[PDB]
Amino acid sequence: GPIITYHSVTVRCSRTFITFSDDATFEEWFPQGRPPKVPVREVCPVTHRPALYRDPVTDIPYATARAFKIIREAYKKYITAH
């Protein structure tokens, strides 16, 4: 099973250490890996500054409802073209 060594060697001085069962136990026990990677900023295209609201499909951060309508216009136009 999970074999752990809490053998606290007091040697004069105090000392303790841990010996995990195996590499699997060490990894699940100490997996870590890769940093948080804070994301990047984004802004609304048409009004050229960030928008709380964002397209439900393409996720474009559209600010105004009219911004939404015009971006939908441009979208459907692009797809119709290609």
């Binding site: 990047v40 900023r41 984004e42 802004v43 295209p45 050229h48």
Partner: protein
């Protein structure tokens, strides 16, 4: 005792803001200095659009009397 300089990049975090913003071009355009009476024709790396503007830097024509 050094001097830090302005940094604009910092990190690869600026994908956007450029496609909407054209880089205003610069040209090695000729020009003339009023302070040179003969008006010797020299050159500037002006941003294209800033063409024909009087030599802005020759306004220091103060002298003894």
């Amino acid at each position: 005792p050094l001097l830090p300089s302005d940094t604009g990049q910092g990190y690869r975090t600026v994908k956007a803001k450029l496609g909407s913003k054209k880089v205003r071009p610069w040209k090695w355009m000729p020009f003339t200095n009023p302070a040179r009476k003969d008006g010797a024709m020299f050159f500037h790396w002006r941003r294209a659009a800033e063409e024909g503007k009087d030599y802005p830097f020759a306004r220091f024509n103060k002298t003894v009397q």
